[PDB]
Design a binder for this molecule. Structure first.
Ligand SMILES: CC(=O)N[C@@H]1[C@@H](O)[C@H](O[C@@H]2O[C@H](CO)[C@H](O)[C@H](O)[C@H]2O)[C@@H](CO)O[C@H]1O
Ligand SMILES: [Ca+2]
Length: 483
C-alpha cells in the first residue's frame, strides 16, 4: 500500500463475452487472459450506463444515472463553427455535456491525496472550453480525444493534449500533420498514416516511463478500441484474422457517423480487440520493468456492452454468450462488462468474484484503497441541497477479505431506448417506455421470460427503488412507471 499506484484501463464498447477469459471463442486475448490468471475476474460487475458518456460520468462522479449530471450522449459540436485542416472541414469546438463543476470527480480526490494523474484516450466529460475539461478537473497529463464523435475516426485531423510537463495553459489541439493531407472519408482515407490508438498508447507509455517509486500515480487509460470505426493498421494482427475468418462481411460506410467503409469486418473487430490486448501486455510489462508491479493495482474494464456499429457483428462474436442485448439496452448485455483486477500479493490470484457492483462504486473503492477515510464528509459540496454519492466500496472483496457490504439495488436509466434497469439480487427489472418487465437472473440469465405478472410485490418493491433513486434532469428524460 503506502499509497499504491492505480491504473484503470477502461476500453470502449467491449461486451462481457468479447474476451477469451469470459468465453470468447474467436479472438485471442492472451495478455488479459494471463492478467485474469494472476488476478480476480468479476462476473457481476456493471457499467454506469449502457452508453459511453454517462457510464464514464458514473465512474468519475461516484453517482448512478438517477442522480448524475450526465445520463446520455449530448453533443455540443453540432452548430460549432468550421476550421479547415488542409481541404478537410472540421468542428472548431468538439465534445459532450460537461460534468457538474460543483461535484467532485475521482482524479480530484487522487490529486488531494498527493497523486500525479494521467489520462490517455477519450475524455467525453465536457467540450473544449467548458467547465469540465481534464486540465480543470484534476488531470496533470492528458492526451487523446476530448470528443466521443471525433473518436469515430482512428485517423483523425487532430488529437487533444493538456500536459503540465509541456506548460500547456489548457487543452490544445495537436494536428495530425500527415492525416490532414487526405480526406476524412472514401478510397483515400486509408492513406492517412497517423493511427490514434497507437499514438495514444505511445503517449500513455511515455507518461508511465516518467513514473518512479516516489510519487504515487493514478492513470486512466480510456483507449477507444474496439469502438467503431472498424479501421486500423493493415498489419500482422489484422492479417492473422483475415486468414482465419472466411468468408467475412463488409461495411458500406456512414460519412455522417465518421465510420469509414471497410472490408473483412470480423477480421477488423477481432484485430481491434487483439491489438488492445497487446497494449495491455505492454502496460503490464512496463510496470515489471520499472519495479512497480507489487505497488500497482491494474483494473481492465469496458464502459458498456457490445456494439453493432461500423460493421461490428455481435451476433457472430456472441455465439457462445449468455447475456441478452447490446449497448443502449438495460438488458444484462448492455450493462454487464468485463472487469479484471490484478495487484500481485494483494488481490488473490486466479479468482472469480461474483460481488454485484457498478462503476459508481469505484470512487469509494479507490478512496478505501488509498486510506482516504470519510470521503463523503470531505468531498461533498455543502452549498448543494443534496450532493449524491451512490457507491459502496468493494475494496474488501477485491483484497479477498471481510466486511464486504452489499447493495440493496443497482440502478440505471437511459433516454435513447427510454429504459430503467434495477437489479436486486437474483431479480432484474427492465422498464421499457414506462412498462416494467421482470426477470430472474438465476433461472433466466438471458432475460427471455418476463415474469412481472407472477411477482406483483417484487415489481412494486423495485418500482419503489426507481421512485426513490430517480431525480429530474432537464437534459436527459426517461418515462417512469405508473405509481
Ligand atoms: C449527429 C450524430 O449524433 N451522429 C450520430 C453518431 O454520433 C452516432 O454514433 C454515436 O456517437 C456518439 C457521440 O457522442 C457516441 O460516440 C456513441 O458511442 C456512438 O454510437 C451514430 C449511431 O450509430 O449515428 C449518427 O447519426
Ligand atoms: Ca462505449
Amino acid at each position: 500500500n503506502t499509497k499504491p499506484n492505480i491504473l484503470f484501463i477502461l476500453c470502449d464498447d467491449m461486451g462481457y463475452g468479447d474476451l477469451g477469459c469470459y468465453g470468447q471463442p474467436f479472438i485471442r486475448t492472451p495478455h488479459l487472459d494471463a492478467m485474469a490468471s494472476e488476478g480476480m475476474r468479476f462476473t457481476q460487475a456493471y457499467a454506469g450506463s449502457p452508453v459511453s458518456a454517462p457510464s464514464r460520468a458514473s465512474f468519475m462522479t461516484g453517482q448512478h444515472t438517477g442522480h448524475c449530471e450526465v445520463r446520455g450522449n449530448k453533443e455540443y459540436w453540432t452548430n460549432a463553427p468550421t476550421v479547415m485542416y488542409g481541404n478537410n472541414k472540421e468542428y472548431a469546438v468538439v465534445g459532450q455535456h460537461p460534468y457538474d463543476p460543483d461535484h467532485v470527480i475521482l482524479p480530484e480526490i487522487m490529486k488531494e491525496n498527493g497523486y500525479t494523474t494521467g489520462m490517455f484516450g477519450k475524455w467525453a466529460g465536457g467540450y473544449e472550453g467548458s467547465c469540465s475539461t481534464p486540465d480543470k478537473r484534476g488531470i496533470d497529463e492528458y492526451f487523446g480525444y476530448i470528443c466521443q464523435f471525433q473518436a469515430h475516426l482512428y485517423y483523425p485531423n487532430f488529437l487533444n493534449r493538456y500536459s503540465k510537463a509541456l506548460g500547456d495553459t489548457g487543452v490544445v489541439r495537436v494536428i495530425m500533420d500527415e492525416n490532414i493531407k487526405y480526406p476524412m472519408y472514401g478510397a483515400d482515407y486509408q492513406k492517412r498514416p497517423q493511427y490514434s490508438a497507437d499514438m495514444i498508447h505511445q503517449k500513455a507509455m511515455e507518461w508511465l516511463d516518467e513514473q518512479d517509486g516516489k510519487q504515487p500515480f493514478f492513470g486512466v487509460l480510456t483507449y477507444t478500441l474496439p469502438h467503431a470505426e472498424l479501421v486500423q493498421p493493415e498489419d500482422s494482427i489484422l492479417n492473422e484474422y483475415k486468414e482465419k475468418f472466411n468468408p467475412d462481411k463488409s461495411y458500406k460506410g456512414s460519412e455522417g457517423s465518421r465510420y469509414n467503409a471497410i472490408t473483412h469486418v470480423h477480421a477488423q473487430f477481432a484485430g481491434m480487440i487483439t491489438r488492445l490486448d497487446y497494449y495491455v501486455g505492454e502496460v503490464l510489462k512496463k510496470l515489471k520493468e520499472k519495479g512497480l508491479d507489487e505497488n500497482t493495482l491494474v483494473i481492465f474494464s469496458s464502459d458498456n456492452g457490445p456494439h453493432e456499429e461500423g460493421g461490428a457483428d455481435p451476433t457472430f462474436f456472441g455465439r457462445d454468450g449468455k447475456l441478452r442485448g447490446l449497448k443502449r439496452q438495460c438488458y444484462e448485455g448492455g450493462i454487464r462488462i468485463p472487469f479484471i483486477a490484478r495487484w500481485p500479493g494483494r488481490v488473490p490470484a486466479g479468482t472469480v468474484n461474483d460481488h454485484i457492483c457498478a462503476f459508481y462504486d469505484l470512487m469509494p473503492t479507490f478512496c478505501e484503497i488509498i486510506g482516504e477515510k470519510n470521503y463523503v464528509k470531505k468531498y461533498a459540496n455543502k452549498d448543494k441541497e443534496v450532493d449524491y454519492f451512490d457507491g459502496i466500496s468493494f475494496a474488501p472483496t477485491l483484497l479477498g477479505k471481510k466486511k464486504q457490504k452489499e447493495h440493496d439495488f443497482l440502478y440505471w436509466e437511459f433516454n435513447e431506448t427510454n429504459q430503467i434497469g434495477v437489479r436486486m439480487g437474483d431479480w432484474k427489472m427492465v422498464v421499457k417506455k414506462g412498462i416494467p418487465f421482470l426477470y430472474n437472473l438465476a433461472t433466466d440469465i438471458h432475460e427471455d421470460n418476463n415474469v412481472a405478472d407472477q411477482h406483483p410485490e417484487i415489481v412494486e418493491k423495485m418500482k419503489a427503488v426507481i421512485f426513490a433513486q430517480h431525480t429530474p434532469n432537464p437534459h436527459f428524460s426517461v418515462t417512469l412507471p405508473e405509481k
